[PDB]
C-alpha cells in the first residue's frame, strides 16, 4: 500500500561512484602527483539517462572520498582535497598558489582516517540545473550549452613539498539529496555518443524494444 | 498514456514508425485473429 520508494529522492539517493583519480609513481598519467576533476555527475554510467528524464532539476550532493593504493592498501600518507568553486582558478601545477587560496575549501585527511565526506550546495546562478538548453549563449558549436550548470572542480594531491612515496587511487562517490524535478520527457531510447549533445547514430537507429515475428504470435 | 508498440515487428530503420500502429482491413474475414500480446509491463516486447 505504500509508495515511498517511487519518490524522486528515493530514486536518486544512493552514493554512486562518479570519479576515480590515479596518482602513479612512474607514469604517463598525472605525472605531477596531483589531479583536477571537474564535477561530472554522469560519472556513474547509469546516471545520465535517469536524470535526462526531466528537463529541470535541483539538489545537493554529498561527496565521500575513498583512497588507497591500487591493491586497495592503506598507508601513512596525508592528502589534500581542494574544492575550487566555479569561477575560481584550478591549479596548473603541484605548487600553484591556488592550493593555498582560503576561498577554495580544502580538507585534509590521512589514508588511515575513514572516508572524507562533505556536502556541496546547489551552485547554479539559475533557479535550476537544466539538462537541455535549446539555444546558444549570447550551425554552431555552442548549441545546448547551459554553462550555469557547473558545480565546480575537485583538486586532489599528496600533501608535502615532494612526490608521495606510494602509488595512489582516489574514488569519489556522490549521493544526491533534496531533489526537485520539472517537465518530464521521453526516456532516451538510443545510444549516447557524446557527453555534450543528444546526437545519436543515424544508421544504427534501433527500435526501443525487443521485436517479434508476427503480431499474432507470442 | 504512452503509445504501446503492439506491432513490434518491423525493424527496418525506415519502418520503425510502423511499430506504433497495427492495421485492420477488408481482406480479414469474420472471426480472424487481428492481434495479440501479454500484460507484461516490465518484460520485453510491446511494453518496452
Amino acid at each position, epitope marked *: 500500500h505504500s509508495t515511498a520508494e517511487t519518490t524522486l529522492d528515493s530514486f536518486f539517493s544512493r552514493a554512486g561512484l562518479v570519479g576515480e583519480i590515479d596518482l602513479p609513481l612512474k607514469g604517463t598519467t598525472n605525472p605531477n602527483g596531483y589531479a583536477n576533476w571537474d564535477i561530472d555527475i554522469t560519472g556513474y554510467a547509469q546516471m545520465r539517462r535517469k536524470v535526462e528524464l526531466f528537463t529541470y532539476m535541483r539538489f545537493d550532493a554529498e561527496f565521500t572520498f575513498v583512497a588507497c593504493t591500487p591493491t586497495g592498501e592503506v598507508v601513512p600518507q596525508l592528502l589534500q582535497y581542494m574544492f575550487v568553486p566555479p569561477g575560481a582558478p584550478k591549479p596548473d601545477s603541484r605548487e600553484s598558489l591556488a592550493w593555498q587560496t582560503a576561498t577554495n575549501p580544502s580538507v585534509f585527511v590521512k589514508l588511515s582516517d575513514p572516508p572524507a565526506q562533505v556536502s556541496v550546495p546547489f551552485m547554479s546562478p539559475a533557479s535550476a540545473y537544466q539538462w537541455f538548453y535549446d539555444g546558444y549563449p549570447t550551425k554552431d558549436l555552442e548549441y545546448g550549452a547551459m554553462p550555469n550548470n557547473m558545480m565546480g572542480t575537485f583538486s586532489v594531491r599528496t600533501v608535502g613539498t615532494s612526490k608521495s612515496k606510494y602509488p595512489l587511487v582516489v574514488r569519489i562517490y556522490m549521493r544526491m539529496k533534496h531533489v526537485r524535478a520539472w517537465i518530464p520527457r521521453p526516456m532516451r531510447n538510443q545510444n549516447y555518443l557524446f557527453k555534450a549533445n543528444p546526437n545519436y547514430a543515424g*544508421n*544504427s537507429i534501433k527500435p526501443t524494444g525487443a*521485436s517479434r*515475428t*508476427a*503480431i*499474432t*504470435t507470442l | 498514456e504512452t503509445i504501446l508498440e503492439v506491432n513490434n*515487428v*518491423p*525493424t*527496418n*530503420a525506415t519502418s520503425l514508425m510502423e511499430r506504433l500502429r497495427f492495421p485492420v*482491413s*477488408a*481482406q*480479414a*474475414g469474420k472471426g*480472424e*485473429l*487481428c492481434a495479440v500480446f501479454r500484460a507484461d509491463p516490465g518484460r520485453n516486447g510491446p511494453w518496452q
Partner: antibody
Amino acid sequence: EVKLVESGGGSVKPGGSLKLSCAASGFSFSTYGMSWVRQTPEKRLEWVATISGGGGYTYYPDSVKGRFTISRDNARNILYLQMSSLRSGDTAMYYCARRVYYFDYWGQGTTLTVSS
Amino acid sequence: DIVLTQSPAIMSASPGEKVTMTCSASSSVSYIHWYQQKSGTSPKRWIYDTSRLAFGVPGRFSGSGSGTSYSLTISSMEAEDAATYYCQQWSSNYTFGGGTNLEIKR
C-alpha cells in the same frame, strides 16, 4: 503443421506464359505477407516478389518487375505467380515462403525449365 | 545492387572443433539472417536479426557482426550440421549470399 505446397511448372518454351500456385495450411494466411524465391540449379537464391497481408502493396525485384505478377486469394489460402514472356534466364526451382523481415517456412518448390 | 560475399565457399571440420563462416557486404547493413539447406530439401530457418536463434537450432550455433562484416560461428561441430548456409539482407533489394558448403572431415 505450417505447410506450403506449390504446384505448376515443367517445360515451357521461351516466350510462353505460366502460372504457379502455392497452398497454405495450418496458419492464418491473411495476417502474413508471402514471397516467392527461386534457386538456380542448387546454388544461387534470388527474391522474385512479395505480396502484402491483404491486397495492399506488391513488391518486385528489378530482374522480374514487368513479367511476373504475384497474387493471393484469402479464401483458399493460396499464393499465385503468373510469369509472362518467360526467358531462358528464368529456369529454376521456385519456393513460396512466408514472411514474418525473415522467411520462416519454405515450401518444397516447383521446378521451371524454360527451353526450346 | 547490394551484394553479399560469403567466405569460404567450402569448409571441412573435424568434428568437435569450431567453425566460423563469414558474410561480408559491399555497403553498411542493419542486420543479417541465415538459412540452412541440406540436399534435396528446401532452405530452413536458422538465425535472424543476426544473433537470435530459430526454435530448433542447437545452442552451439552463434551469430554476431556489425556494419559490413557479419559471421556465423559454430562451436563445436557435429556431423549433423553439414549443409549450405546462406546469409541475407533486408535493407534494400533483398539479396542472398553465395552460401558456404560445410562438410565433414575424415
